[PDB]
User: Which sequence fits this backbone?
């Protein structure tokens, strides 16, 4: 049973609380789209772990490559090159929009955003970084200063030169031009403001193709291109942080591929490790050379470690081979409609947005009022757990509670249905 008294005794005894509440269970096993507690009760994982396990839990291909390398090649001196490292880097150059030629292998997104930011600063001589008001780029310094989603209050000043502009949020438009939401004009407006505050040292703009931690906010048509022109106009580098959106989760190998806008630096992590700490950045050949000329340095314990590189290269192979990018769209459209149906039955569902297998559902007190649902969201996530379907809801201000639904890219048609069902029941007994 989950109750194991001596387990929770030790938990409250020696566990540091990093914000949030611990599920009242004990996960002892995880497979495909399920995790099991002490009693063996199966739980449908509609969060792919922490937006990671895109290949599902303990995917045999990953289990295979891991053992296969943990015993042959594991950790090396940062100065020694292996085959998993050079091939992973090569693969990344090959599957990323033309222009992105060289990669750096790290362990985390925060780490990856750090790397890209420092490189942009170095090749520009500038140090000012601009991002979105609801972005989440890690819990780490240079990557945490550009994170206005959370973690900047009560821990001293932010990082010198950090600016945030609003993110284009079509569901709750707050910038109007001619009785319409002109999110592009809203961009100029935001930038003009930034220019007056800037000391002329803008080095780059960092953005998620889909702001995950900020309530699953997708960047509208033509925005990305506009953002790019804005940066080019100011000698800025555009950095796309695809830690949760990269690797086919949104229906494209890379979400930036859909807008057709290639970033100066792309960063990956969550979905590249598939539950394993692997990250990376890819930049153009020219940028890499210039940064090299300025003595660009970024050492980490695991930079260029064979094992993580091997698992990452194997994750890519599984995604391509089993065409999981397509899988994301099919299972996504299926999940999206099932959601629109539920939205057709319950009024508390104000919006269904997102893309591929990265969807969000905002709960409102009334669809016409778009008035956030007080705790209603939490109530349903609670009912969803009892029903055996693990959910995740983010609560941002001026916005209603938002469910971030992200099943594995290996989720079956039936598992999608099962989830949809559980969710519907969750809402029924939640109201
Ligand atoms: C989750 C996330 C990160 C942080 O990854 P960590 O391993 O926790 O450092 C960075 N960027 C984005 C867009 C993320 O979603
Ligand atoms: Ca190393
Ligand atoms: Na490329």
Assistant:
């Amino acid at each position: 049973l989950n109750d194991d008294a001596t387990f929770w005794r030790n938990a409250r005894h020696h566990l540091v609380r990093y914000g949030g509440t611990f599920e009242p269970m004990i996960i002892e096993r995880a497979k495909g789209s399920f995790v099991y507690d002490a009693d063996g009760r199966a739980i449908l994982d509609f969060t792919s772990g922490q937006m990671s396990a895109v290949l599902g839990h303990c995917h045999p291909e990953i289990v295979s490559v891991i053992g296969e390398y943990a015993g042959k090649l594991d950790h090396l001196f940062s100065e020694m090159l292996s085959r998993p490292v050079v091939d992973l880097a090569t693969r990344l150059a090959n599957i990323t929009p033309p222009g992105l030629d060289r990669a750096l292998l790290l362990s985390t997104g925060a780490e990856s955003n750090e790397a890209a930011i420092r490189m942009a600063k170095l090749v520009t001589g500038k140090y000012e970084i601009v991002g979105f008001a609801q972005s989440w780029h890690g819990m780490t310094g240079a990557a945490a200063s550009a994170t206005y989603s959370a973690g900047r209050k009560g821990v001293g000043p932010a990082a010198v030169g950090s600016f945030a502009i609003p993110a284009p949020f079509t569901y709750r438009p707050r910038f109007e031009r001619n009785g319409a939401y002109d999110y592009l004009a809203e961009l100029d407006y935001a930038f003009d403001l930034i220019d007056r505050q800037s000391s002329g040292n803008l080095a780059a703009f960092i953005a998620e193709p889909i702001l995950s931690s900020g309530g699953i906010i997708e960047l509208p048509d033509g925005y990305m291109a506009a953002l790019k022109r804005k940066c080019e106009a100011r000698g800025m580098l555009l950095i796309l942080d695809e830690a949760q959106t990269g690797v086919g989760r949104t229906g494209t190998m890379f979400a930036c591929q859909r807008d057709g806008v290639t970033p100066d630096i792309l960063t990956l992590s969550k979905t590249l490790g598939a539950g394993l700490p692997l990250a990376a950045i890819v930049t153009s050949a020219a940028i890499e050379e210039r940064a090299h000329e300025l003595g660009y340095l970024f050492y980490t314990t695991h930079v260029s470690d064979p094992l993580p590189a091997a698992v990452g290269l194997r994750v890519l192979d599984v995604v391509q081979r089993d065409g999981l990018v397509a899988r994301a769209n099919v299972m996504g459209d299926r999940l999206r409609r099932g959601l629109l149906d539920l939205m057709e039955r319950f009024d508390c569902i104000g919006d269904v947005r997102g893309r591929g297998l990265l969807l969000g559902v905002e709960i409102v007190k009334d669809r016409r009022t778009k008035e956030p649902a007080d705790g209603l969201g939490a109530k349903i996530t609670r009912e969803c757990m009892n029903l055996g379907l693990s959910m995740n809801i983010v609560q941002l201000p001026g916005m209603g509670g938002v469910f971030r639904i992200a099943p594995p890219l290996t989720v079956s048609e039936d598992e999608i249905d099962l989830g949809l069902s559980l969710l519907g029941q969750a809402i029924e007994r939640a109201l």
The two ends are 30 Å apart (CA to CA). The domain at 59-322 is CATH 3.40.640.10 (Aspartate Aminotransferase; domain 2). The CA atoms of residues 93 and 101 lie 5 Å apart. Residues 108-110, 113, 136-138, 208, 212-213, 241, 243-244, 269-270 surround pyridoxal-5'-phosphate (ligand 1) (CB under 6 Å).
